[PDB]
Scaffold this motif. Structure first.
Motif, short mmCIF file in Angstrom:
data_model
loop_
_atom_site.label_atom_id
_atom_site.label_comp_id
_atom_site.label_asym_id
_atom_site.label_seq_id
_atom_site.Cartn_x
_atom_site.Cartn_y
_atom_site.Cartn_z
N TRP G 35 8.12 -1.23 -6.63
CA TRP G 35 7.39 -0.77 -5.45
C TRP G 35 6.27 0.16 -5.87
CZ3 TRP G 35 12.19 0.48 -6.95
CH2 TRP G 35 13.25 -0.30 -6.47
N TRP G 37 3.13 2.70 -4.44
CA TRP G 37 2.55 3.49 -3.37
C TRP G 37 1.22 4.04 -3.82
CZ3 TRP G 37 7.73 3.75 -4.47
CH2 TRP G 37 8.60 3.40 -3.44
N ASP G 41 -2.99 6.63 0.14
CA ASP G 41 -2.67 5.64 1.17
C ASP G 41 -1.20 5.69 1.55
OD1 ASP G 41 -3.59 2.57 2.30
OD2 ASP G 41 -1.52 2.70 1.65
N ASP G 101 -4.66 -5.89 3.60
CA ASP G 101 -3.22 -5.80 3.83
C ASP G 101 -2.43 -5.90 2.53
OD1 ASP G 101 -2.68 -5.12 6.41
OD2 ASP G 101 -1.81 -7.05 6.98
N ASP G 102 -3.05 -6.42 1.47
CA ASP G 102 -2.38 -6.46 0.18
C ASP G 102 -2.53 -5.17 -0.60
OD1 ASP G 102 -1.53 -9.01 0.72
OD2 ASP G 102 -3.11 -10.00 -0.44
N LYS G 105 -1.35 -0.64 2.18
CA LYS G 105 0.00 -0.90 2.68
C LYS G 105 0.55 0.25 3.51
CE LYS G 105 1.78 -4.88 1.10
NZ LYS G 105 0.81 -5.17 0.02
N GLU G 108 4.69 2.94 3.75
CA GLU G 108 5.79 2.20 3.15
C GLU G 108 5.45 1.72 1.74
OE1 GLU G 108 3.63 1.46 5.77
OE2 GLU G 108 4.65 -0.22 6.76
N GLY G 109 4.19 1.43 1.49
CA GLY G 109 3.77 0.95 0.19
C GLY G 109 4.09 -0.52 -0.01
N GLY G 110 3.49 -1.09 -1.04
CA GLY G 110 3.66 -2.49 -1.33
C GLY G 110 4.68 -2.75 -2.42
N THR G 111 5.35 -3.88 -2.30
CA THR G 111 6.21 -4.39 -3.36
C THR G 111 5.34 -5.01 -4.45
OG1 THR G 111 6.48 -6.48 -2.19
CG2 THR G 111 8.11 -4.76 -1.78
N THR G 165 -1.80 5.65 -8.21
CA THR G 165 -0.92 4.65 -7.62
C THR G 165 0.44 4.82 -8.27
OG1 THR G 165 -2.67 3.10 -7.05
CG2 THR G 165 -0.45 2.22 -7.32
#
Lengths: 203, 236, 213, 203, 213, 236, 203
Positions: G35, G37, G41, G101-102, G105, G108-111, G165
């Motif tokens: 994950w 983050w 953001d 959207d990629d 995020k 919650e952040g992106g996988t 990040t």
């Protein structure tokens, strides 16, 4: 010259939002009764101080009231600028307590119903006991009033209490023989020595 | 000394080189340098002197009628009066100033901007005007209650009849420039608006349609880099 | 430092690009270039550098001149054939001195005048025109008249006419014609600027005056 | 207060006619475009300085410009008084150079054709880079401007060169609601630190 | 000392080799080069120097540019005839400044822009691009969007676009066509590198982003 | 002075020359140098920070499943577990590291290599692992009795759970390089092997399949010469 | 122990929002890819710092990353906590730049899609060049990372740029033989040495 309330300068609490929040200036007419702005209810919804009102359960603030009457020198009129300490208003001929919309007027502020008795049962003729200046357009085009912390509680809620109440009253109505023309009342309030604690949700 | 090998860029006509050349007339003495007043050693001396802008910014208005705003007695209270953008390198009121036209001769422009307004009314004319400098990124305020959140000045005309708005040097990057296009982040500079707080009040014998003139100049901290040919003029 | 007026005005902008033709113009020509072009040095012909120099009234500077000449083949020949060498005698004519009228015009010897020698197969001609005007700066404007007669032209200085930068083919004519594009670059060094003016907003129509439309 | 051009006082040339030559004051109206007086062409024909213009082939002079706008305090208007250094004028929509009568206007001076572009292709909006004051009748009834020697030549002919050019422009037109009434522009010029050599015939 | 980052990144690798054609492209062409090529200076077009410069995040350097131009004959002519001379006006367009669209595109005068003059029969053009970006280093990546709109491209800086290195034929067209191979060499001097990244393992597909496959 | 005659290599475009040239913009001041953290003055600062390698080195395994070894309880005692070559400029586990990919950007690479392994097991997991650094030239050991002849470390996981193997700078020549081909004498670097000495012992409630992660970094004595274009990437 | 990025403590800019903004802790499984983050953001929409992101056009901030892996001692697993400086991501097998959207995020952040190449074309095997710690549950249950200002620009927009990040990657998947059970990744971020200028509208 300023007329600091009862000869004392405001300060922080003993043991950011100082922008001059200029309001929408009201039209002064011959038939204008007078306009009152309850503080901080006149600044409850405008500016970073207005957001600090909602974001904090408790607050303290002084106010540097500045009223501007830009006028020709041929214009006539003196307004009582009085910052009432704790103006509990009243309604004419009713025993009912005045409600939300008759007091929580927001940024625009409320007009005066019967300003000669100051809409509270007192007399405006004695209301020069107050923090008070004159905007007599013969000599004075702009007045200012310095307001310290005025509450028996040291630091209380903004959104359910008005400490000061500005009241700009035409004791003498406007004169320019074109009944009335231009003359706005630029009421600019700067919350000075502002302090906010109790970081809770924005109410 | 004797063995020299040339540079890769040797023999190139450079538009902005500064190496001296042999004079055409070696025995000519030029005219002696006399003290002409107004010596310009830098364009900044041109920049911190005032310049009016098209504060009306209404498309129908042209000439000085667009150079001046007309605040009337019949203008409604809490009315947008300027809406001046500060994109001095783009289109706006401020494009035909020393600040705008000098900044269009460069690319990277930095500095705090003084904005003096003088109210051209009668001596007996009065009225409190609220003038808000919106910070960059923030949109235009349309009412007074959306205006005093930013740095705003309440201006009763009084006796001074001339205020200044020192727009501070605030930007996302450390200079402001063209951004290669107007549609970007640092290209927008922030708006300056004016409204009437207590309305213009004039005597019944004086002029009803009052007026007001803006100015721009810089502070001493203004700087310019990457001098470029402006789109203000062109040959055809 | 980048905004210094010495750094500001010293940009080599093209103020006269004359694609003058190299052919036996003595055969049949009426008004055109006879293997030479007579250009009075005024810094007002191209409006970028002009509006750069309408910023000020009085502009005393050492005017570096850079002449870049490119020889292209003519459309009448329609053949490339290779670029031949051609040395150019680039004369500056000062104010009062006479200007040539032919390629072999008997003024090219330049007993008083100053001329430089260079080739097309050589990097461009960089010399520095001395600040030669009688007045102590270049009044790019003239609110007055050059002569004391009424029909004298408005806006023209009898002292700030820099000269005539006259460039010819000192060599003889070729049987194959060649269009020589001579580009003139002004690098004003030692800027002494005085009394700033507003930048020009309306487009120009005449080089000499400052009319507006 | 004076606004000496670029902060330097005028003086004689390094190694009598100081009378304030008041002009015929022009009527300022609402529709008045603006009036320019080229110097010394505004004083070429008036006074002992005017005779010194003809009697001398060369000259140098500073000018103490003083514009007076005698007005009621109820009058409205600001004029840009700008003394342009070396104002080469232009004509609208023509490529022809403007002639004698469009520039050599004499003591009365010329009106402005299109003063927003200052009749020279520039913009008057930037023309406050100039020697400049304001005669805003709210506060300023009379302005003055000090002009040194402004020519690249040290000392030149008066009758075929204008060094300075006064330009009094209504950036805001007049307001007294009787369209316009009275308000003359008393432009008084004193040639200060005047010097004349080359004693020849009176041209 | 050989492993110093100044010694590491200062290798003149070819990042744009444009064999742009020299012919009357005004006659009949639609999209191709009109005797000029507009190349935005990005150091990411060729993957050797790119992966050399994906080693770090922030790379403040004085970017020396070396332009080596070789003129070869066209296949349409199919004749050698000898190599003719051709001077090239190599302009750098900074960020915000306009880019030309023709060979005679009216921007080549470069009143504000910086252009250099050189010939094909002269050793290659060595000048040094100043570190011109608004940020204090060249963020070769951008985890963000250039504009505040949603459709702004990911990975592109509105400040690290170095410019447009636009090279034309200032001379007129030849009747015989010539393919001019312009090779662009980056010698980044004064390396100020920050925050090292892993070298890239998967091959690239797009110059702008850092996608993987 | 005046008489100069050119060099034989005069007018040559050199890929790695360092003589300065005339700047394109002479009057441009660049952006002021602000203290960005992480200043790289040399690649060695990149080299002595750790990097995992493909210690599984099994062809079927890809991803992190090849980045980690899986020491199971059912793994037999005295079993070859890494067999990692140290040809950082050739194919192996160590090719996708800072050490390997930086060394592939040069030719002549020298220095001692620290090899820290951290055992990613449970806190209650235990087991003694014998890790042998075979000297260069010596082949792979397959049993423990052929393994402790070289410099080997017995590692009970204990409380530290992270050991380092300082492979010393030992070579036939005084640098190690490409040798122009892999089939040479100095091209081979020597093997590092691991076996289980007393077997992995895990609780019956904890995870049976334990794991372990390697690292590489350099010492301060690492040096690189003859910078070359690596075969890690290429255009097509 | 903290592992401050490249051995320097964060500070203000040379010439309030320090609350540990704990995120919603992600379930770590055996099949968990990892994950990421992006900062700020991950904190663009939460807290007073999240409101300062919208209310200010420009910003600077360091971040005190603290990842917590509360686990039994019988649990198995090490996560690479790497704070990538300026992680320009990529998408697998496409030449298209990854969109809003990629990347944007939110909190919650992106996988991670393919975390072995770190979803950017690099290798995660070398991604220990980064600000990095280990949460190997044998010895380390909680790691922390100190992040200074990481941008070539001195002070830029938060809402259209990610400086750091976070990336928490299972280099070794979870082991408790009940495939996976509990173990959240409590990622708490405190913006330390935060500074905000450019008081504009809340974007």
């Amino acid at each position: 010259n300023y007329c600091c309330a009862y000869g004392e300068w405001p300060n922080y609490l003993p043991d950011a939002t100082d922008r001059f929040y200029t309001l929408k200036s009201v039209k002064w007419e011959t038939e204008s009764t007078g306009w009152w702005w309850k503080l901080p209810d006149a600044l409850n919804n405008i500016g970073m101080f207005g957001q600090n009102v909602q974001h904090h359960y408790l607050y303290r603030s002084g106010f540097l009231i500045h009223v501007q009457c830009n006028a020709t020198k041929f214009h006539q009129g003196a307004l009582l600028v009085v910052a009432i300490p704790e103006h509990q208003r009243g309604a004419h001929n009713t025993t009912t307590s005045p409600g939300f919309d008759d007091i929580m007027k927001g940024e625009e502020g409320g007009t005066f119903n019967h300003p000669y008795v100051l809409d509270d049962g007192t007399s405006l003729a004695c209301a020069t006991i107050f923090p008070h200046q004159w905007i007599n357009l013969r000599t004075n085009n702009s007045a200012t009033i310095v307001l310290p912390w005025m509450n028996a509680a040291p630091m209380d809620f903004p959104l359910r209490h008005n400490q000061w109440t500005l009241a700009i009253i035409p004791v003498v109505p406007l004169g320019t023989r074109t009944v009335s023309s231009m003359v706005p009342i630029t009421v600019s309030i700067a919350p000075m020595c502002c302090e906010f604690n109790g970081l809770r949700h924005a109410i | 000394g004797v063995p020299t090998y040339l540079l890769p860029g040797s023999g190139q006509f450079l538009t902005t080189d500064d190496h001296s050349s042999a004079p055409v007339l070696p025995c000519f003495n030029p005219t002696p340098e006399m003290h002409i007043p107004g010596q310009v050693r830098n364009m900044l001396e041109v920049i911190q002197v005032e310049s009016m802008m098209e504060i009306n910014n209404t498309e129908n208005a042209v000439g000085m009628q667009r150079l001046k705003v007309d605040i009337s007695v019949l203008t409604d209270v809490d009315q947008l009066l300027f809406n001046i953008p500060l994109d001095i390198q783009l289109d706006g009121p401020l494009r035909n100033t020393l600040v705008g036209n000098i900044s269009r001769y460069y690319t990277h422009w930095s500095g705090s901007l003084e904005m003096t307004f003088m109210f051209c009314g009668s001596f007996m004319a009065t009225g409190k005007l609220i003038l808000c400098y919106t910070p960059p990124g923030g949109s235009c305020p349309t009412t007074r209650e959306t205006a005093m959140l930013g740095t705003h000045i309440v201006w009763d005309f009084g006796l001074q009849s001339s205020v200044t708005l020192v727009i501070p040097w605030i930007s996302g990057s450390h200079y402001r420039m063209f951004n290669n296009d107007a549609k970007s982040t640092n290209a927008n500079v922030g708006y300056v608006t004016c409204f009437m707080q207590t309305n213009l009040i004039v005597p019944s014998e004086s002029s009803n349609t009052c007026s007001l003139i803006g100015f721009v100049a810089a502070k001493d901290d203004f700087s310019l880099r990457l001098m470029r040919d402006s789109p203000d003029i062109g040959q055809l | 430092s980048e905004t210094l007026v010495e750094n500001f005005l010293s940009r080599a902008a093209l103020v006269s690009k004359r694609s003058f033709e190299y052919k036996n113009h003595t055969s049949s020509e009426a008004r055109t270039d006879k293997n030479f072009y007579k250009w009075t040095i005024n810094t007002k012909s191209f409006v970028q550098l002009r509006r750069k120099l309408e910023l000020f009234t009085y502009l005393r500077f050492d005017a570096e001149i850079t002449i870049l000449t490119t020889v292209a083949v003519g459309s009448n020949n329609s053949t490339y054939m290779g670029l031949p060498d051609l040395t150019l005698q680039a004369m500056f004519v000062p104010t009062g001195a006479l200007t040539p009228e032919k390629q072999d015009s008997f003024h090219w010897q330049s007993g008083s005048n100053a001329s430089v020698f260079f080739k097309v197969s050589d990097p461009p001609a960089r010399m520095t025109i001395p600040f030669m005007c009688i007045n102590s700066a270049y009044s790019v404007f003239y609110d007055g008249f050059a002569g004391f007669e009424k029909n004298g032209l408005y806006g023209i200085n009898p002292a700030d006419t820099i000269g005539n930068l006259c460039v010819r083919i000192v060599n003889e004519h070729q049987p194959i014609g060649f269009t020589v594009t001579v580009r003139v670059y002004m690098k004003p060094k030692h800027i002494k600027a005085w009394a700033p003016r507003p930048p020009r907003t309306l487009p120009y129509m005449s080089i000499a005056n400052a009319n507006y439309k």
